[PDB]
Design a protein around this ligand. Structure first.
Ligand SMILES: C[C@@H]1O[C@H](OP(=O)(O)OP(=O)(O)OC[C@H]2O[C@@H](n3cnc4c(=O)[nH]c(N)nc43)[C@H](O)[C@@H]2O)[C@@H](O)[C@H](O)[C@@H]1O
Ligand SMILES: C[C@@H]1O[C@H](OP(=O)(O)OP(=O)(O)OC[C@H]2O[C@@H](n3cnc4c(=O)[nH]c(N)nc43)[C@H](O)[C@@H]2O)[C@@H](O)[C@H](O)[C@@H]1O
Lengths: 629, 629
């Protein structure tokens, strides 16, 4: 009857914190008065609070049901929509989440958190402008929001605007000191900016704040890998510490069910998070199309954030050839291990290493008898659980001084196999004849460029008169970086008129054809590029690589030796200079060499598919035979 | 590249009607330009059209998925929300439907259909005011909408405002001639208004428009049941035609799996759509609480639109005593039959008949070996599939001339068992002493009142000087009905100062105690009331019923004979007059009779639970024994 007393008691209980008594009084009051607007709104508030409390325990479905009931009681309640969107993001239902966050923002403009999360979701789908404007609106509502600032820094780092990203990241750091993701992202930006010391200092601070930060430590090892000259071994100790901590942090499986018979078809699962237009994809294009599917079964574990045309064609080839394609995006590592075990897989090959969106969590438990890393992260994995790694004799000489935590297998010919792009197109003749001077070109990452490389390149330019230099890098999208690089080059005694810094090219065939203007390709050291060397050799421009005592330093040496140009490798910097001078001496030899290298690489073992496939299958058979005995 | 050509081609295909080519061009254009607002909106339009086309085929889930994708493309598209709400209403997910219809209305105020459907949904949950205002808004947008007018007429008919409902129903009929639900509802209102001839004419027109209208025909038979004097038999022929058409319209099951052993516990399933505060519920309160659950298992099939406290207590008693409670609201009859068969039920008892929200669709197939009607619709069911019906010897004398399509079983004592309300309260003494005159009272439905009853009541009033008359009926909520009734009474020679027409009482105990002002209760004929007689006898006021040749006419006779007041029954109208005069002759006898009748009914077989339960269980055992042999 008297619903006023019931609602007053319910309000008192809610303020006191008793949800059951309050919800009972609220229920009875609404039964007495079905159209009590204030009572209905308070009922919605109480149900939202109860749903949040339940979601604290972990019952997602019950919280969602309570939220839906509250929304039914009050359709235009914003916090309910926000909670629904958060839950839908948790359950990986992205479209419903987008809709609900947008509705929450429309109803309540003052919900900056919803806008920030919407920007996050849009950025996860490579909608850069939408994320930028979402974060800008978040700043418009709450200028002092740390998460929005950090994610805007992420987006600007991806876009290449390093100065603004650095400014905003520093603003976030000074806003919140106990916030490590800002340190990690500052250091990521520093690494992509071409300087390493402050990047290492940054992740060191980050690890001090967060001892158990996986991303921070992993990228810290990656950053140290850049400046490894092969003289010190503290990097090995850091890798060992990372591996031991990671192993002690996660459980492992010691049970196996695979048959002990060494004579049976092998299930090979290629697990990789980057099957889109990535360097790795190129080198995986041929083997998948070249395996004996009947003799060896093939499965794919793709964690790609966004599938592309290459992903679709790979899926078509796998399914047509008798394979299984699976998507593992947005799944916890434990579920990944469980599904891997339940798939009766024999061997697994990971192609990520300590890189973006890696899946070392799978290796945390060793779900399969054999796990091997083959391409990504040329340096040692550092995990004791990881058993073996794939390499050759050239990049890894038997007398190497590079200690490895895991055993190595030397492939007969090489462990690289490049695949031409379908629309690569013809190669234009040597432009030296048109312009009358040599134009050295480098299409490597700025992070691989070091002061030593700059000095060597300056010596190269000064050695031969009338020499041009062209460099293509993403960080050459900002004027400040360009000015700093030009000033650094001039400090060594090089004019700025002979330097051409170019930005990225969105269209792949344009990037492929951009090699037409280059004459001689020069590789950076110590962390020498791998895909760039093959890309250059395919277009006919000669490539020069310096040797070294590290596997990554010798990748280019191995590639050049295999393709048939082993005479184009210099052991020391001085020999590099003399080789470059000899190359620049004559133009006709360079021209006809450019003409021949196309067919030379076509007929080389590098481009041979069936032979490499047979060698790799024999390697797998030997691996399984060793496991059986 | 050129997305303009792709979008133009897609528009051309959509106009031409080619959905596949249009969706392909739309897909490629959005891939080229991820942020083409016009292209995105047209994509949403095309997806909505495709979803509607798919839902035409019948694939509800695929249409819902397409609608959700379209909404993701365009969050503020109203038609998508409308379609989502329609689908959610189809899948019986009511709360989500309410939310989505409300959102669609908020985005697009010009969607009168969404408002109409929202009003329908709210009315389905007894939210009368919300439905009224929804339909009023629909008229505010589209005054010429037939469905909104008809449903507003429904609501006003339920509320008791018959004049406005009739006006709006006539408006709907003249708006749309080929629209039978309007005829059915006009006739329903006429039936509830107390007049039958035009109601029968109305459903006759309705059946002419729609030969296979189940509701129209069923309620047509119900209406004829009101004016049945036991002289004509055309009603039996109409029932036979209805039964034959219904049987030929639906399939039947001829397979049985129940054991042939006559000695085993019997599973009895009480199927009824009205387990809320309804007359039937009262008479079912005792048997369920009085069965031998161990010897006979009990299950309940409730199709109640809205559960109440009585429903909750019945569920508690069933579950506590060892029974199963099931809700069958919003389920197709085929699924009902399938679940009934899968429940291993032995016998089923239906308590609806040709009444509101009946479930004769279940009887269409005879899912159980034994189906019996016991309470609802005292007249014959008319379905040949229905095997047997329950009655006694008093209301159904062995020498009856009322032919029945189904065999009858005569219970030993009676087939009625009333249950007192827990809060009935004490009975006040006879008010005749306070006021000095007799006050006849009638608490029956207006539809049961006929001109013959009015003439008889006028004769009763004129016979004894200083007599008051009080009548309680729902249609006495409108002034026009009251004036018409008073004019009709005055035309027979009765003053209006001795007539008191009262409306309904919302609170049950108030209705129970309203009998305190009554002195003698008078029953209508031929369709005599059943629950009202027991309700009156429980409060101590004597009840008078005229005999007849019909079962419904003799229900009151049987009740009065069983309770012990068989001397208070008159065979003819004249004997009714003399009995009433004799009752009114003395006041002291009436007073002490009022005092005694409480205990008299308490000790009568009518209120005896265990004895009736034993008799009913013996009846069931005999039924199963007959089935076995
Ligand atoms: C397999 C891995 O390869 C890694 O090489 P890594 O440094 O990324 O050498 P990157 O040249 O930076 O790889 C980026 C890839 O993107 C493409 N790409 C390069 N420039 C452009 C451009 O300007 N526009 C567009 N649209 N695409 C471009 C090209 O296929 C190149 O291989 C090694 O670091 C690892 O050790 C390992 O060998
Ligand atoms: C079991 C069935 O009973 C049927 O009796 P039927 O006409 O509905 O006789 P009614 O009196 O109309 O039934 C309506 C029920 O609602 C309650 N009720 C009556 N008046 C009021 C009121 O003023 N206010 C409120 N809140 N409740 C009221 C009371 O329990 C009454 O039995 C027969 O027609 C069938 O043949 C069959 O016997």
């Amino acid at each position: 009857m008297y619903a006023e007393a019931y609602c007053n008691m319910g309000v008192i209980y809610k303020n006191r914190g008793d949800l059951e008594m309050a919800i009972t009084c609220y229920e009875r009051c609404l039964a007495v008065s079905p159209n009590f607007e204030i009572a209905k709104n308070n009922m919605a508030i109480a149900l939202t609070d109860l749903g949040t409390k339940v979601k604290l325990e972990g019952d997602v479905t019950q919280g969602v049901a309570y939220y839906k009931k509250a929304l039914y009681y009050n359709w235009h309640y914003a916090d309910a929509m926000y909670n629904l969107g958060v839950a839908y993001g948790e359950m990986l239902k992205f479209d419903m989440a987008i809709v609900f966050y947008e509705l929450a923002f429309h109803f309540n403009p003052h919900c900056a958190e919803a806008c920030n999360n919407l920007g996050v979701l849009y950025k996860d789908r490579d909608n850069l402008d939408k994320a930028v404007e979402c974060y800008q609106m978040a700043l418009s509502i709450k200028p002092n929001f740390a998460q929005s600032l950090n994610n805007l820094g992420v987006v600007y780092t991806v876009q290449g605007k390093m100065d603004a990203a650095a400014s905003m990241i520093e603003k976030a750091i000074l806003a919140n000191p106990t916030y490590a993701e800002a340190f990690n992202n500052l250091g990521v930006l520093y690494r992509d900016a071409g300087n390493i010391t402050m990047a290492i200092d940054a992740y060191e601070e980050c690890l001090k704040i967060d001892p158990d930060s996986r991303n921070a430590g992993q990228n810290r090892l990656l950053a140290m890998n850049y400046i490894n000259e092969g003289l010190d071994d503290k990097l090995f100790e850091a890798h060992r510490d990372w591996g031991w901590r990671f192993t002690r942090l996660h459980p492992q499986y010691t049970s196996w069910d695979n048959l002990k018979d060494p004579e049976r078809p092998i299930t090979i699962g290629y697990i990789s998070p980057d099957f889109f237009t990535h360097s790795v994809s190129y080198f995986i294009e041929a083997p998948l199309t070249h395996h004996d599917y009947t003799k060896y079964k093939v499965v794919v574990y793709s964690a790609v954030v966004k599938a592309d045309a290459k992903t679709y064609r790979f899926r078509d080839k796998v399914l047509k050839k008798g394979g299984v394609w699976k998507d593992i995006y947005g799944i916890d590592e434990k579920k990944i291990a469980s599904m891997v075990r339940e798939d009766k897989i024999d061997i697994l090959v990971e192609l990520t290493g300590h890189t973006a969106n890696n899946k070392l969590g799978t290796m945390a438990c060793r779900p399969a008898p054999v796990q091997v890393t083959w391409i990504g992260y040329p340096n040692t994995t550092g995990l004791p659980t990881v058993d073996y790694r794939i390499t050759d004799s050239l990049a890894d000489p038997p007398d190497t001084k590079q200690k490895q935590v895991e055993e190595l297998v030397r492939l007969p010919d090489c462990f690289l196999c490049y695949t031409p792009s379908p629309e690569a197109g013809p190669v234009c003749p040597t432009p030296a004849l048109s312009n009358g001077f040599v134009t050295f070109g480098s299409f490597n990452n700025l992070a691989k460029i070091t002061p030593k490389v700059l000095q060597v390149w300056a010596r190269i330019l000064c050695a031969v008169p009338n020499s041009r230099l062209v460099v293509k890098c993403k960080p050459f999208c900002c004027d400040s970086i360009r000015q700093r690089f030009l000033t650094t080059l001039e400090q060594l005694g090089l004019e700025s008129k002979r330097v051409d810094l170019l930005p990225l090219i969105l269209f792949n065939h344009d990037h492929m054809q951009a090699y037409s203007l280059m004459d001689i390709s020069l590789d950076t050291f110590p962390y020498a590029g791998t895909t760039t060397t093959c890309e250059s050799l395919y277009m006919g421009v000669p490539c020069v690589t310096m040797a070294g005592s590290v596997h990554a330093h010798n990748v280019g040496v191995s590639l050049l030796t295999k393709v048939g140009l082993g005479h184009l490798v210099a052991k020391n910097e001085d020999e590099y200079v003399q080789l470059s001078v000899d190359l620049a001496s004559d133009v006709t030899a360079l021209s006809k060499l450019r003409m021949s290298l196309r067919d030379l690489m076509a007929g080389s073992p590098v481009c041979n598919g069936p032979s490499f496939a047979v060698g790799l299958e024999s390697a797998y058979r030997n691996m399984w035979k060793k496991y059986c005995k």
